[PDB]
Amino acid sequence: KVSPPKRAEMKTSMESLIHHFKLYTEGYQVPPGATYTAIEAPKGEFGVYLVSDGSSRPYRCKIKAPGFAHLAGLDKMSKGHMLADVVAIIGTQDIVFGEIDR
């Protein structure tokens, strides 16, 4: 009821086929609630604030990217420096803009 069964079991079993069908059409229902899960990603603390309303779709998914806070702090780090060391500071902050912009 969460993971899809193996394909052989799906093709030979009734409950397995029903669960394969429902997981690949509707998906599993996540019980309602909100969590903040933080993982030590290589660029920094990568967080997901997930809010579930009880259905098979997330009500809210906030993505906390470390690069957001780092680039917010870029102006503070770049004090009394030039263009070249500003380039260096951008490099030394582990910055990818997919996670920053989302």
What's the closest the beta carbon of residue 84 comes to other proteins, in angstroms? 8
Q: What is the nearest approach in angstroms of other proteins to the Cβ of residue 67?
A: 8
| Strand 33-40 with 45-52, pairing | antiparallel
Site for other proteins in 18-57 (CB under 8 A): 19-21, 23-52, 54-57
Read off the tokens for 14: 């009734």
Size of the site for other proteins (CB under 8 A): 94
Q: Which 59-98 positions form the footprint of other proteins (CB under 8 A)? A: 59-78, 80-94, 96-98
Name the minimum Å distance from CB 53 to other proteins. Answer: 9
Tallying the residues shown for the chain, one arrives at: 102
In the numeric block, the tokens 């079991």 are attached to 9
The answer to whether the beta carbons of residues 61 and 39 sit under 8 Å apart is: no
Amino acid present at 93: Q
